[PDB]
Amino acid sequence: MKWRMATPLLMQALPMGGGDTRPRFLWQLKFECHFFNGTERVRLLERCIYNQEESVRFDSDVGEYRAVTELGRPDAEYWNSQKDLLEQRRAAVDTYCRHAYGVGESFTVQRRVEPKVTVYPSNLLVCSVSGFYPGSIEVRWFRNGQEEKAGVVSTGLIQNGDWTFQTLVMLETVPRSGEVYTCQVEHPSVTSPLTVEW
Amino acid sequence: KEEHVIIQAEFYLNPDQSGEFMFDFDGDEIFHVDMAKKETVWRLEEFGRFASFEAQGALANIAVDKANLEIMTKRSNYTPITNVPPEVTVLTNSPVELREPNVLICFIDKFTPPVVNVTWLRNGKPVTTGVSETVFLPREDHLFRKFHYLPFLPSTEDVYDCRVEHWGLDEPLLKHWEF
């Protein structure tokens, strides 16, 4: 079960051997596991950031530490000299990234929540698509089997922050009697396109 | 072709002495570590059925982070962070319909350092009922994101305000929402 964590490295406390409006100093650390085509190719980036500006990075593609800014020179050289913590990070793509994938894959990669669709007038016809996951989605308007790519405006994808998404796609038209409108949504969470008619 | 990205994001901030530890999956928080209680807090409690995490590991990491921050601060000759003011948007979880339970979302974006005081006002009145918030979410440009939530009962009479304070702001930002 246990989720695994990567540990950052200490900087040398001896650069030269033995011998409220207050200003803020920020240090950020990021372990990025990038997965390509599932787990076929996995890339690990360790990023060290001082005051929003990255100073030194480890890239699995590079296989060693590289300074990003002048501030990062001592860290790259010091850490690269430790030639068996460098070996340790090279196989982190397996021990850390790929491991976390297998553990994670169940409720992240494979997480599927069906969108809720509601259509209502506002001179406007709004198709509301909410509560879905993942974010990749395509929403199209149907006028009784005919679609227009004119007067269509979408809010784009909105991330709610609770592992759900929403989006609103409106159609510019004053709905007359007789005509039939259809909003159709395609998503990985469903096996057949969702239709809601008006 | 890239498909998914898992990001372990930590930070430390002086002189505030604040720090966080979280995992990010495609922009969504997987979990964070409650430093004071030393417990793993999953974003969705269902996540804890499938996985576990030793919360202690986060505290040790953050201590290494402070350690390296002290060195970086002195090495940079005490160069302070440049403030970046937040972008604020107020939204609802679902389309609002009268007397049917909904949730107000206050989205704070594109800001640094990760320090923000957020207050919810309704009809001029400060509210604390049922409020919640996420940790400071990571960004590729190394800025921050944060979500604030307010469950509410949609009404024609009530009016809401989201007020956000940040050092990068000229004056606090109030963002409005009405039926």
Residue numbers in the entry:
A (entry chain B): -30 to -12, 2 to 104, 113 to 188
B (entry chain A): 2 to 180
Paper text:
These MHCII proteins are capable of binding and presenting both foreign and self-antigens to potentially activate CD4+ T cells via cognate T cell receptors as part of the adaptive immune response. Initially, the class II-associated invariant chain peptide (CLIP) occupies the MHCII-binding groove, but can later be replaced in the endosomal compartments for higher affinity antigens.
We introduced an alanine in position β82 deleting the two H-bonds between βN82 and the peptide's P2 site, which have been shown to contribute remarkably to pMHCII stability. Strikingly, Surface plasmon resonance (SPR) measurements report that the binding of the mutant to DM is massively increased, showing a KD value in the 100 nM range for DR1-βN82A loaded with CW as well as another high-affinity peptide (HA), while binding of DR1/CW to DM was hardly detectable. In order to elucidate the basis of this phenotype, we solved the crystal structure of DR1-βN82A/CW. Surprisingly, the DR1-βN82A/CW structure was nearly indistinguishable from the high resolution DR1/CW structure, with an root-mean-square deviation (RMSD) value of only 0.432 Å. Moreover, nuclear Overhauser enhancement spectroscopy (NOESY) spectra of DR1-βN82A/CW in solution did not indicate structural alterations if compared with the much more stable DR1/CW complex, and chemical shift differences between 1H-15N-TROSY-HSQC spectra of both DR1-βN82A/CW and DR1/CW were restricted to the site of mutation. Thus, even in the context of an optimal P1 anchor residue, a mutation in the β1 domain α-helix leads to a kinetically instable complex (DR1-βN82A/CW) that tightly binds DM. This biochemical phenotype is not explained by the ground-state structure as detectable by crystallography and NMR.
